[PDB]
Design a protein around this nucleic acid. Sequence first.
DNA 1: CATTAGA
DNA 2: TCTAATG
Length: 327
Amino acid sequence: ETLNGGITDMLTELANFEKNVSQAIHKYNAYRKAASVIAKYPHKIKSGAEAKKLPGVGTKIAEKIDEFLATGKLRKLEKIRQDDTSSSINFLTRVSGIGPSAARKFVDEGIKTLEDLRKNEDKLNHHQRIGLKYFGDFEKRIPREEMLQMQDIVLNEVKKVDSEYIATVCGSFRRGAESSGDMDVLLTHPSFTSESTKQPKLLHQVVEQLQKVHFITDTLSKGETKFMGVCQLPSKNDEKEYPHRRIDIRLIPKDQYYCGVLYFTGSDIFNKNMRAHALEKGFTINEYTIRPLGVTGVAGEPLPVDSEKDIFDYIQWKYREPKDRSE
DNA sequence: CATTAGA
DNA sequence: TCTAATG
Ligand code: NA
Ligand code: NA
């Protein structure tokens, strides 16, 4: 957790590198497992040889561990950190819609920067166009004070469209959090479940409501169940307009909502931890359901849930406020 | 780990 | 269809 901190960071760094810049999944997975195991190891690694004793730790990684052990740095690390091309990629990549593949392709063409990008909008597809367009707004956190303003907006349309809708803003937002990355709205309707073969307008009506009042201003990806776009609070009585925010609205089979909402609500640790518990308490949990665990090894059969409670009761735990779903 | 775009 | 990208 700190006793191995550098070896781990160098490692993640290293790793990250083969992945983006080069296309070396292997080496790249190589670093992460290594990174994974040393992170655990209960002692201060004093040498490559010692490290080497671990699993996932080959000769190649030990070597690097020495140099970093000996001199507060690593050459290769130094070299990459420097190198413009590689730097360009980790950079382009910050654009929503840009990832390793397009990043290298752009660079190999010469677009290394934000400007370049603009000069070449035509070489960019609508997602990226927008990523570019709101590049600034996209990196800016979401003040909770703002979230509450938003949510207040969405719940209101949802309801006005159909009283039957059920929406829940998930995430850290939900877990009390001060700021937030982007808004996650979990959506559902009675008339829609595991079987009841869709109702695409079900999603589409809201998306359309939301736009009709200008909360959504853009569409990244709209499909029959997941809609990925952009929204913005009204810029009041001018002098101050609100930055553009990322929003994801998703349709849910009313019969799997709470597993959904339980889940997206995180945290990542609370999950696994709750998840690790159902297992003792003879179960299984995942994004949509909760099935009783059969001794033959496995076993099916989706218990029925009507609230985040059911799930608790089921595995028989303490109802944990989202607030405290921290770990 | 699954959903959408794109070409 | 494959492949990329966000989640
Ligand atoms: Na070994
Ligand atoms: Na990106």
